[PDB]
């Protein structure tokens, strides 16, 4: 039955990226779109689109990576260095406008659900609003 679709979703990315897959699927959902919407706006995913898994609306998240590396164990760079959820179904994390975190001194982004939509760590600040801290990415 799962709990937070987002939680396991971000994990799809994580586990996939770790093994360097082309892309991975995940049950289609409103919020997940918003997630990828911003997860592409800032540039962490090649893109996405609704697909089919035996009459089951999924979502193909096409992963992005880095250039090939020289030296021992040619490990391709990770575009998504790290992505972890903050507002858990256990602890609903609500932050104020002048409380929104600064992911790794700007280098990162804080995907959160504002009261007027969904914005980045900076985008939410610009519009001057706060919301549920979905997760951070860097």
């Amino acid at each position: 039955m799962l709990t937070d679709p987002i939680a396991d979703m971000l994990t799809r990315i994580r586990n996939a990226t770790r093994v360097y897959k082309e892309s991975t699927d995940v049950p289609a959902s409103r919020f997940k779109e918003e997630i990828l919407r911003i997860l592409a706006r800032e540039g962490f995913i090649k893109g996405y689109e609704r697909v089919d898994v035996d009459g089951k609306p999924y979502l193909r998240v096409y992963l992005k990576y880095g250039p090939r590396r020289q030296g021992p164990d040619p490990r391709p760079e990770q575009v998504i260095h790290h992505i972890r959820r903050i507002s858990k179904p256990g602890r609903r994390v609500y932050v104020g406008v002048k409380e929104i975190p600064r992911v790794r001194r700007g280098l990162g982004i804080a995907i959160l659900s504002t009261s007027k939509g969904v914005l980045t760590d900076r985008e939410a600040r610009k519009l001057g609003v706060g919301g549920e801290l979905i997760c951070e990415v860097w």
């Binding site: 602890r91 609903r92 994390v93 609500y94």
Partner: protein, 99 residues
């Protein structure tokens, strides 16, 4: 102003008086989880028109009796016995906690 609460009638076994439960949720002072606690209030119903399980509103009013400083307002919905259960069942289990 005159504080008003939206609770449920959980006890109507008194004269012109009715007990009402009120659940209020809020972030934990340290752990920020949306915890939920409650309390029982004794309302003044000179009409007795409000029955059990009747979700009603209560307003901070003139002292009626000892542990009674509130009065009823209006019904929100009649059939709500299911909630009454949650209260009753909690009571039951208590009897099986002692010795």
């Amino acid at each position: 102003p005159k504080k008003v609460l939206t609770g449920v009638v959980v006890s109507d076994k008194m004269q012109k008086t009715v007990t009402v439960l009120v659940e209020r949720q809020f972030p934990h002072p340290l752990y920020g989880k949306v915890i939920k606690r409650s309390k029982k209030y004794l309302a003044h119903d000179p009409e007795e028109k409000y029955k059990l399980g009747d979700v009603v509103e209560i307003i901070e009013s003139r002292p009626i009796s000892k542990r009674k400083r509130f009065r009823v307002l209006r019904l929100v919905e009649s059939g709500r016995m299911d909630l009454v259960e949650k209260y009753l069942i909690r009571r039951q289990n208590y009897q099986s906690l002692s010795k």
